[PDB]
Write a protein that binds this ligand. Structure first.
Ligand code: MG
Ligand code: MG
Ligand code: MG
Ligand code: MG
Ligand code: MG
Ligand code: MG
Ligand code: MG
Ligand code: MG
Ligand code: MG
Ligand code: MG
Ligand code: MG
Ligand code: MG
Ligand code: MG
Ligand code: MG
Ligand code: MG
Ligand code: MG
Ligand code: MG
Ligand code: MG
Ligand code: MG
Ligand code: MG
Ligand code: MG
Ligand code: MG
Ligand code: MG
Ligand code: MG
Ligand code: MG
Ligand code: MG
Ligand code: MG
Ligand code: MG
Lengths: 129, 156, 123, 205, 82, 80
RNA sequence: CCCGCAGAAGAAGCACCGGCUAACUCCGUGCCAGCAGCCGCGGUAAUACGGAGGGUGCAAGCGUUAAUCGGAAUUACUGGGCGUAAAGCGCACGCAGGCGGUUUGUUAAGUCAGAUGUGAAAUCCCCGGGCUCAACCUGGGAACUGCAUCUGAUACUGGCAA
RNA sequence: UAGCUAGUAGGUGGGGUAACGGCUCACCUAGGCGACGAUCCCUAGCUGGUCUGAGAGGAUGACCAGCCACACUGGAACUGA
């Protein structure tokens, strides 16, 4: 069974970057758009779109740079078997600041850099380095 | 400018109809004092002819490392076949906290302040390959500005 | 391995033993000699190793190597043992202290001399 | 607590002059400086990692005359202070009282600068101080006191102290025999053939 | 009863005296309710050696604490100083 | 105002008394997993209103018995 | 603590030197006498045993044994593995347990933020202060990862509902 | 070591204590605890701390300070805040 529909979103990115896929398609969700919005404003993916009325279907336009993948590493952290919460001074750094860590804070999902500024921590989603 | 260090020298053998025949592997590493680092491997019947070949094969297949001031830019890992290797940036005062063949490839590289650890095998041949593997995928504060179409100050 | 498997049954550490069980976490023990004898070692070595059989105060009956060249031990002698095994003699786990309580030191010794219980010669 | 063996026998093991003699006469006329001491001294075997980490650490102890448990604590106090550990270490050695007596030239060598201190002939802030290991904050004036200000060896050592290259960061007089510790030394004004980072990596195991 | 007394916490030949609010049945260097100051007889010049939190000493006396005979000289001194 | 606790009725076979298991949901001190824990309490109910499966809310009081120092306040979710 | 006097006087040992591991040569034995933490040494040229000269390391201490943790990612939460090196139950069904697609509302248990009450002193750390320096002693903080309580957030997990 | 428990588990009333309470007794009910480890055996004074380690941890509880227990062994009360 699909226990973890967010780890499949990161897996389908990670697998498509190694296959030089122009785009990856997947089922849509409310949580998948908020992750794919942080993935575009921070710059890792070029575009995202969602089509469908009864059952929507998201589609990420994957991004490449000079012949290699922009998403260099993408990892699940707070899996269904182990949840990870950090206070606002316990927030992780990924690649010494040269890579973001998508966090679920109470004012919407944002990055870790934006969540230190808000003065509030949250559940860590993933490391997109 | 090409400074040089030889790491290990070991005697190998080979059985024939007559008997056993010996020969000498010699493992080096080179580097100038900034990001260009290389290494070579030569094998011959006699040791001065085999440190010759390894130091000759080291002066080519040099590779660039985007150095920071005297150190790394972020934590990084590197594997080659037996040896997983961790090395970590540091601040001016702690020196090369490393060891083995991992120490020598770090001296001629141009880097002076590391924290580091060797896990797995510490075969000196493979562990110089797992540390070049870790230095080569260390990415600068401006190659990530180029990658996401950004300026460095928006990344800090 | 998995995080539910380490809750229900945690990781368990191997309880390490000791190879000097008659000292019983004591540095030295006083014993009484019961047989002085010699013994040939295992192969590839070849000698006549000088080693006695001691009755310790805590009740244990162990063999104990007598180091150095020449000694003055008899039966019913009262010596002090310390630990550390002689490798090539299978069964010997203890050494004797030369220069402690009945044992005299090595005669004519001038090097590594504290190890063998010899007063400093004045020259 | 002091090295009481031959002086130039330690310079021969390390390789250069550690300045343990006053140098009126030339060191290449008194001891064979580029040979190790002993029967097997001319042979130079190839030295390892632990050799050159230890040889560098012995070289900086033997210049200044500190022993090991007191030199071990200079490493744990250089590391505790803020900033660069190995550069903090030399600033501790350069704050000893028998070193200020040698940088101000009141003694001939660092041991005769020590025995000026060891026999109660050195004031600090107008107070008699006996210890060779008094750490000196800046602005602390240090002087020959009036008890020993006529000794035949102090101004005879100032004739040597002109011949040595003067330290930048201090001040001293020729007739008044007082000296001011104006600041603690910058690293570039220390000698640059001391490989201070090897001592760090030896202790930082 | 609750008392304000001294407590010897120093090195040998160099006494230092923590003044502490304690229950009077305990030991000298043992259990106490509240540290309310200190006193040093081997104090130097140009520094402080005798400091007493008087906001609490007036509290506990009106509560009903007693005062040591030696503290009652230190309250006599600091009420010369100001 | 009062430090109160919900719980679940586990048995009510002794009279003017109920036993109440109170679930708590607390992290592990090593692994970081969350684990359901269970605390039973003997509760004094007067007038014998509680039955099995019934959620209840309780409060702490003076000791009524050897094992009984909790008393309820109200009842929710009687039925199935 | 200080002032003086006479006098270099009264005041240096312990381990180690084949590789690991800083430090090498002659002579004595001759698989003997011995060494030894591991690998190993000794059967007639022993940088390995015993003595010497020389050297190295620490030093009023230096060794040895005992005990602890570290190296050991060698019980791995951080942080390992299971085709052949040890390691997938012979195969299955299934209760407790673990985990659970997608939208909306509500709730606020987990989660998060701030405040309050407690977290003894000493110790650890930071910046100072005093014994000639140091050890040692003391002033102010910081810390004490926690726990309760009150108000607020609602992204995510749980509860209830469609 | 997988079953343990009869004042045992709760109820009502009398006594009792400085005070709540099976604390004690009479009477009723037939419960209570346990796989989230009851019972049983082996060991052990607890903490603030200490030692080790980059950390997470692992080992430890000598001095100093907090709390408990005993005063030759096994029992018992008296006087008194
Ligand atoms: Mg290995
Ligand atoms: Mg020796
Ligand atoms: Mg430092
Ligand atoms: Mg050897
Ligand atoms: Mg060597
Ligand atoms: Mg030997
Ligand atoms: Mg032969
Ligand atoms: Mg010979
Ligand atoms: Mg471990
Ligand atoms: Mg071990
Ligand atoms: Mg393995
Ligand atoms: Mg197998
Ligand atoms: Mg199978
Ligand atoms: Mg099945
Ligand atoms: Mg769900
Ligand atoms: Mg909450
Ligand atoms: Mg909170
Ligand atoms: Mg404290
Ligand atoms: Mg001071
Ligand atoms: Mg919610
Ligand atoms: Mg929901
Ligand atoms: Mg009753
Ligand atoms: Mg009553
Ligand atoms: Mg006991
Ligand atoms: Mg470690
Ligand atoms: Mg007795
Ligand atoms: Mg009794
Ligand atoms: Mg009375």
């Amino acid at each position: 069974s699909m226990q973890d529909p967010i780890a499949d979103m990161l897996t389908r990115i990670r697998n498509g970057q190694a296959a030089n896929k122009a785009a990856v398609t997947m089922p849509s969700s409310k949580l998948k758009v908020a992750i794919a919005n942080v993935l575009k404003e921070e710059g890792f993916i070029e575009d995202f779109k969602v089509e469908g009325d009864t059952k929507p279907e998201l589609e990420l336009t994957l991004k490449y740079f000079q012949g290699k993948a922009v998403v260099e590493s993408i990892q699940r952290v707070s899996r269904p078997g182990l949840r990870i919460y950090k206070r606002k001074d316990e927030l992780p750094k990924v690649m010494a600041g040269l890579g973001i860590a998508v966090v679920s804070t109470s004012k919407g999902v944002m990055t870790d850099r934006a969540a230190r500024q808000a003065g509030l921590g949250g559940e860590i989603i993933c490391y997109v380095a | 400018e090409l400074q040089e260090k030889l790491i290990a020298v070991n005697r190998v053998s080979k059985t024939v109809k007559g008997g056993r025949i010996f020969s000498f592997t010699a493992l080096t590493v080179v580097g100038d004092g900034n990001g260009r680092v290389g290494f070579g491997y030569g094998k011959a019947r006699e040791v001065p002819a085999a440190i010759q070949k390894a130091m000759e094969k080291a002066r080519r297949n040099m590779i660039n490392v985007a150095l920071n001031n005297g150190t790394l830019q972020h934590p990084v890992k590197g594997v080659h076949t037996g040896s997983r290797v961790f090395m970590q940036p540091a601040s001016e005062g702690t020196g090369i906290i490393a060891g083995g063949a991992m120490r020598a490839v770090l001296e001629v590289a141009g880097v002076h302040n590391v924290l580091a650890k060797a896990y797995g095998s510490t075969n000196p041949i493979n562990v110089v390959r797992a540390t070049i593997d870790g230095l080569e995928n260390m990415n600068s504060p401006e190659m990530v500005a180029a990658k996401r179409g950004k300026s460095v100050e928006e990344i800090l | 391995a998995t995080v539910n498997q380490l809750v229900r049954k945690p990781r368990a550490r191997k309880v390490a033993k000791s190879n000097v069980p008659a000292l019983e976490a004591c540095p030295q023990k006083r014993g009484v000699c019961t047989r002085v004898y010699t013994t040939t070692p295992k192969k590839p070595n070849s000698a006549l190793r000088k080693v006695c059989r001691v009755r310790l105060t805590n009740g244990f009956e162990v063999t104990s190597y007598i180091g150095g060249e020449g000694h003055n031990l008899q039966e019913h002698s009262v010596i002090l043992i310390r630990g550390g095994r002689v490798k090539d003699l299978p069964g010997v786990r203890y050494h004797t202290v030369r220069g402690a309580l009945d044992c005299s030191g090595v005669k004519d010794r001038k090097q590594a001399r504290s190890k063998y219980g010899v007063k400093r010669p004045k020259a | 607590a002091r090295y009481l063996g031959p002086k130039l026998k330690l310079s021969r093991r390390e390789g250069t002059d550690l300045f343990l003699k006053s140098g009126v006469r030339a060191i290449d006329t008194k001891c064979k400086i580029e040979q190790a001491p002993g029967q097997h001294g001319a042979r130079k075997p190839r030295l390892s990692d632990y050799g050159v980490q230890l040889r560098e650490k012995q070289k900086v102890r033997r210049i200044y005359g500190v022993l090991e448990r007191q030199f071990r604590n200079y490493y744990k106090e250089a590391a505790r202070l803020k900033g660069n550990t190995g550069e903090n270490l030399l600033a501790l050695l350069e704050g000893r009282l028998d070193n200020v007596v040698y940088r101000m030239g009141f003694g001939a060598t660092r041991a005769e600068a020590r025995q000026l201190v060891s026999h109660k002939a050195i004031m600090v802030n107008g107070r008699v101080v006996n210890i060779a290991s008094y750490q000196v904050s800046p602005n602390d004036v240090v002087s020959i006191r009036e008890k020993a200000k006529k000794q035949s060896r102090v101004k005879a050592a100032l004739e040597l102290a002109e011949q040595r290259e003067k330290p930048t960061w201090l001040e001293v007089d020729a007739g008044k025999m007082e000296g001011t510790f104006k600041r603690k030394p910058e690293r570039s004004d220390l000698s640059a053939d001391i490989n201070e980072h090897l001592i760090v990596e030896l202790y930082s195991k | 009863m609750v008392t304000i007394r001294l407590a010897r916490h120093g090195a040998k030949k160099r006494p230092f005296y923590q003044v502490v609010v304690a229950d009077s049945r305990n030991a000298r260097n043992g259990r106490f309710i509240e540290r309310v100051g200190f006193f040093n007889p081997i104090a130097s010049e140009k520094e402080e050696g005798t400091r007493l939190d008087l906001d609490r000493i007036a509290h506990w006396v009106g509560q009903g604490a007693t005062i040591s005979d030696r503290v009652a000289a230190l309250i006599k001194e600091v009420n010369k100083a100001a | 105002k009062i430090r109160t606790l919900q719980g679940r009725v586990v048995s009510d076979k002794m009279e003017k008394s109920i036993v109440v298991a109170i679930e708590r949901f607390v992290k592990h001190p090593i692994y970081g997993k969350f684990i359901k824990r269970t605390t039973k309490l003997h509760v004094h109910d007067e007038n014998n209103e509680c039955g099995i499966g019934d959620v209840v809310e309780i409060r702490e009081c003076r000791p009524l018995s050897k094992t009984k120092s909790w008393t309820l306040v109200r009842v929710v979710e009687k039925a199935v």
